[PDB]
Amino acid sequence: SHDCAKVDLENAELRRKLIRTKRAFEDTYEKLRMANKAKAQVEKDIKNQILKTHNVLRNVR
Amino acid sequence: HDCAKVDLENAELRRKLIRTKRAFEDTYEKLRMANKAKAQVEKDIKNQILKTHNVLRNV
Amino acid sequence: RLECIDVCSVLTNRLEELAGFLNSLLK
Amino acid sequence: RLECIDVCSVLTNRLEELAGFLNSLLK
Ligand SMILES: [Zn+2]
């Protein structure tokens, strides 16, 4: 069959790697989510500035 | 231990680590692309600010 | 219906707020 | 320098480019 010690060590190592990789993915994902929210707000404010600017320009003519 | 159990857990942990690694590399890649776009956009914005203030100051 | 000096003022105010807004994008 | 009509023109051109630029930020 297998080597008991070897698969135990691989098991512990895979659990450690999965904890590290999970934390890294949850952190990168969280930063991505914050960036998406900030994206929404900035796009709203930009749209507002575009509308003000075009109202000014159109009402100049 | 239980040989079958730790073999199954090892296979499952390897699959989970592949999925989680792929997810982290994809999310990280999107973050990096967003950082590059951040740099370029900040450059262009700075340029527009400078043009605008030059116009306003010369008024 | 605005005279030239008024147009200048309105454009200037819009431009000033746009400068401030872009600057706020850098933050 | 520059007379009021010229100021209006320069401000207008700056504002038009700023509108286009912000719109490009949405893309
Ligand atoms: Zn065993």
Author numbering:
A (entry chain B): 1081 to 1141
B (entry chain A): 1082 to 1140
C (entry chain D), D (entry chain C): 518 to 544
Paper text:
Thus, Cnn molecules have an intrinsic ability to form large, LZ:CM2-interaction-dependent assemblies that are critical for mitotic centrosome assembly.
We also solved the structure of several LZ:CM2 complexes that contained slightly shorter or longer versions of the LZ, again based on PSIPRED predictions. These revealed structural consistency in the four-helix bundle at the core of the interaction interface, while the coiled coils of both components that extended away from the core bundle demonstrated variability, both in terms of flexibility (angle relative to the core bundle) and the degree of order within the crystal. Two Cys residues conserved within Drosophila species in the LZ region (C521, C525) line the interior of the coiled coil, with C521 consistently forming a homotypic disulfide bond. A slightly longer version of the LZ can form micron-scale structures with CM2, whose assembly is stimulated by Plk1 phosphorylation in vitro.
